[PDB]
């Protein structure tokens, strides 16, 4: 079973992303808080793989507890919300160096979440209230190259847009 | 009446959160009971087969730690939850107080998480032994789980994750609890409390890691004299390269201040042992800038102080390059004393 660990700031929507992916439908009105360690049967490139997904929601503020999830990881998804520049910055400041410290050889995919909101008018105006703007694709590709990520991928847990490709690319980044 | 829809939405969601807290508590207790049943009960029912396959009692002890104490606590916690949410979860129910009641019982996690690093690393070694991997997998199978599922490592990881889940569940529950709602202050209290529980686990593991650093430091020092660092100390407070002036020979030496101890070494195993002072049989006299007396070999002392090893009648001088490095060291030693004196 491939080990895919999801790392990133709270309010990236890690739990939401994983739930939406694994259950094939955005949960809707209520987004669950808990995602148990999951093992799915995924079909990638005509071959069946066994994808084990591990969520880290809650451990974001507890630095000595986090590393316990890292041993034996096959691929990390470092996540940031495309409508939260802070969480983007923390790709550089907090998550990449930590993941690289405990796992220097394990592949890293930079995943931008909440794609559905990057051009959502209300969100953009609200961001502009605090002199901020959503992360654009080139910015994120730059970030991905900087930390030497195997890939940069955007997606939306709501619309499922580009969601399948994230975990397919994880599986592909492990097998090869 | 649009607000009539909004308040009802808040409660609809609050109910969702309560149901999640309860259901996932049930799942978690279920998991703990699996770990107990498939492994521990099985190993105890036949301890001889366990041993003759490769699992010593020390191994099981390090592997599963105090998972059963955690289980006990969650049987009680869950019972309390079910009682609080009777006959089913409903919006007006108040869960804050339950958490608050158990805020102190959760300390059992501190032992467990601190141990987990040691556990999984050991597990990596145990999976190298063929018959032991065989055994652990058999335990997984008889427990109703498969080999194409999450491996044992994840179940062993699950409590860390779970204890870290409560502040989230409570933040969301608080988000769905109106100001006038009776549960409100108790929920916010529960949030702060569980956050403190988690932080406490974190710090416990941190300061236990400092010990690993004491052992590793002692290993890197050649020709160690006296008792072990992990025997008499808890953490390194300060290290740096200073100028040491004995009676008749001057060299630069690397200093290490621990709680209860002061060590100095010769930089090259990165270091070579040169000396140790117990800090209560130590005295610090200040030297004023431009002083040149017997101990300093008649050298001009600036940014310097005298260290009296009273247990050996020995004085010597320490000098730091910059004016501030001095203050850093002096306050470090004053800190060490105040804390050691306070501990009594």
From Swiss-Prot, chain A:
Xref: CDD domains: Rac1_like
A single GO cellular-component term on record: focal adhesion
Effect annotated for changing residue 71 to L: In MRD48; decreased substrate adhesion-dependent cell spreading; weak dominant-negative effect
Description of activity control: Regulated by guanine nucleotide exchange factors (GEFs) which promote the exchange of bound GDP for free GTP, GTPase activating proteins (GAPs) which increase the GTP hydrolysis activity, and GDP dissociation inhibitors which inhibit the dissociation of the nucleotide from the GTPase. GTP hydrolysis is stimulated by ARHGAP30.
Glycosites: 30, 33
Locus of motif Effector region: 30-38
Top-level taxon: Eukaryota
Ranges annotated as spanning the membrane: none
Localisation: Cell membrane; Melanosome; Cytoplasm; Cell projection, Lamellipodium
Residue numbers carrying (Microbial infection) O-AMP-threonine: 33
Tissue: Isoform B is predominantly identified in skin and epithelial tissues from the intestinal tract. Its expression is elevated in colorectal tumors at various stages of neoplastic progression, as compared to their respective adjacent tissues.
Membrane topology: Lipid-anchor
UniProt-annotated binding residues for GTP: 10-16, 29-30, 32-33, 57-58, 114, 116-117, 156-158
Effect of residue 68 to A: Strongly reduced interaction with PLCB2
An MF annotation (GO) of this entry: thioesterase binding
One example of a Gene Ontology biological process annotation: intracellular signal transduction
EC number: 3.6.5.2
Residues annotated with (Microbial infection) O-AMP-tyrosine modification: 30
Impact when changing residue 33 to S: No interaction with PPP5C. Translocates to the plasma membrane; also
Phosphoserine found at: 69
Function field: Plasma membrane-associated small GTPase which cycles between active GTP-bound and inactive GDP-bound states. In its active state, binds to a variety of effector proteins to regulate cellular responses such as secretory processes, phagocytosis of apoptotic cells, epithelial cell polarization, neurons adhesion, migration and differentiation, and growth-factor induced formation of membrane ruffles. Rac1 p21/rho GDI heterodimer is the active component of the cytosolic factor sigma 1, which is involved in stimulation of the NADPH oxidase activity in macrophages.
NCBIfam families the record matches: small_GTP
Entry domain remark: The effector region mediates interaction with DEF6.
Assembly information from the UniProt record: Interacts with NISCH. Interacts with PIP5K1A. Interacts with the GTP-bound form of RAB7A. Interacts with SRGAP2. Interacts with CYFIP1/SRA-1. Interacts with PLXNB3. Interacts with ARHGDIA; the interaction is induced by SEMA5A, mediated through PLXNB3 and inactivates and stabilizes RAC1. Interacts (GTP-bound form preferentially) with PKN2 (via the REM repeats); the interaction stimulates autophosphorylation and phosphorylation of PKN2. Interacts with the GEF proteins PREX1, RASGRF2, FARP1, FARP2, DOCK1, DOCK2 and DOCK7, which promote the exchange between GDP and GTP, and therefore activate it.
Stated name of the protein: Ras-related C3 botulinum toxin substrate 1
Organism taxonomic ancestry: Eukaryota, Metazoa, Chordata, Craniata, Vertebrata
UniProtKB/Swiss-Prot annotation, chain B:
Tissue-level expression: Mainly expressed in peripheral blood leukocytes and brain. Expressed at intermediate level in spleen and lymph nodes, and weakly expressed in other tissues.
Domain PH: from-to ranges: 235-338
Compartments where found: Cytoplasm, Cytosol; Cell membrane
Domain DH: from-to ranges: 13-204
Description of how the protein assembles with itself and partners: Interacts preferentially with RAC2. Interacts with RAC1. Interacts with AUTS2.
Described purpose of this protein according to its UniProt entry: Functions as a RAC guanine nucleotide exchange factor (GEF), which activates the Rac proteins by exchanging bound GDP for free GTP. Its activity is synergistically activated by phosphatidylinositol 3,4,5-trisphosphate and the beta gamma subunits of heterotrimeric G protein. May function downstream of heterotrimeric G proteins in neutrophils.
Name of the protein in its database record: Phosphatidylinositol 3,4,5-trisphosphate-dependent Rac exchanger 1 protein
Organism, as annotated: Homo sapiens (Human)
Lineage of origin: Eukaryota, Metazoa, Chordata, Craniata, Vertebrata
Boundaries of the shown chain within the full protein: 38 to 398 of 1659
């Amino acid at each position: 079973a491939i080990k895919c660990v999801v790392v990133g700031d709270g309010a990236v929507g890690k739990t939401c992303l994983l739930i939406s992916y694994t259950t094939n439908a955005f949960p809707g009105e209520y987004i669950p808080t808990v995602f148990d360690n999951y093992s799915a049967n995924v079909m990638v490139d005509g071959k069946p793989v066994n994808l084990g997904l591990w969520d880290t929601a809650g451990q974001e503020d507890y630095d000595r507890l986090r590393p316990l999830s890292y041993p034996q990881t096959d691929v990390f998804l470092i996540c940031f919300s495309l409508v939260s520049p802070a969480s983007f910055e923390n790709v550089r400041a907090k998550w990449y160096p930590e993941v690289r410290h405990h796992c220097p050889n394990t592949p890293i995919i930079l995943v931008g979440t909440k794609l559905d909101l990057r051009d959502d008018k209300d969100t953009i105006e609200k961001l502009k209230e605090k002199k901020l703007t959503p992360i654009t694709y080139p910015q994120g590709l730059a970030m991905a190259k900087e930390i030497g990520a195997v890939k940069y991928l955007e997606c939306s847990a709501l619309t499922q847009r580009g969601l399948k490709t994230v975990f397919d690319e994880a599986i592909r980044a492990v097998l090869c | 009446f649009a607000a009539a829809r909004e308040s009802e939405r808040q409660l609809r969601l609050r109910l969702c959160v309560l149901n999640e807290i309860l259901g996932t508590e049930r799942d978690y207790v279920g998991t703990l009971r699996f770990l107990q049943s498939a492994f521990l009960h099985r190993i105890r029912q036949n301890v001889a087969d366990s041993v003759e396959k490769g699992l010593t009692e020390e191994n099981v002890k390090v592997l599963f730690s105090n998972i059963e104490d955690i289980l006990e606590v969650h049987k009680d916690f869950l019972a309390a939850l079910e009682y609080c949410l009777h006959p089913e979860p409903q919006s007006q129910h108040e869960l804050g107080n339950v958490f608050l009641k158990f805020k102190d019982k959760f300390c059992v996690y501190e032992e467990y998480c601190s141990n987990h690093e040691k556990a999984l690393r050991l597990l990596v070694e145990l999976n190298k032994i063929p018959t032991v991997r065989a055994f652990l997998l058999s335990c997984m199978l008889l427990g109703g789980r498969k080999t194409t599922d999450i491996p044992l490592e994840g179940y062993l990881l699950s409590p860390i994750q779970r204890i870290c889940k409560y502040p989230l569940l409570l933040k969301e529950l608080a988000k769905r609890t109106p100001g006038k709602h009776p549960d409100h202050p108790a929920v916010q209290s529960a949030l702060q409390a569980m956050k403190t529980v988690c932080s406490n686990i974190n710090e416990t593991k941190r300061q236990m890691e400092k010990l690993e650093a004491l052992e590793q430091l002692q290993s890197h020092i050649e020709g160690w004299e006296g008792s072990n660092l992990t025997d008499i100390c808890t953490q390194l407070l300060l290290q740096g390269t200073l100028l040491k002036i004995s009676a008749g020979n001057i060299q630069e030496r690397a200093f290490f201040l621990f709680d209860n101890l002061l060590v100095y070494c010769k930089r090259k195993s990165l270091y070579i042992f040169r000396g140790r002072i117990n800090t209560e049989v130590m005295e610090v006299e200040n030297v004023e800038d431009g002083t040149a007396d017997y101990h300093s070999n008649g050298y001009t002392v600036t940014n310097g102080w005298k260290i009296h090893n009273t247990a050996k009648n020995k004085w010597f001088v320490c000098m730091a390059k910059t004016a501030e490095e001095k203050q850093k060291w002096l306050d470090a030693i004053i800190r060490e004393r105040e804390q050691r004196e306070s501990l009594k």
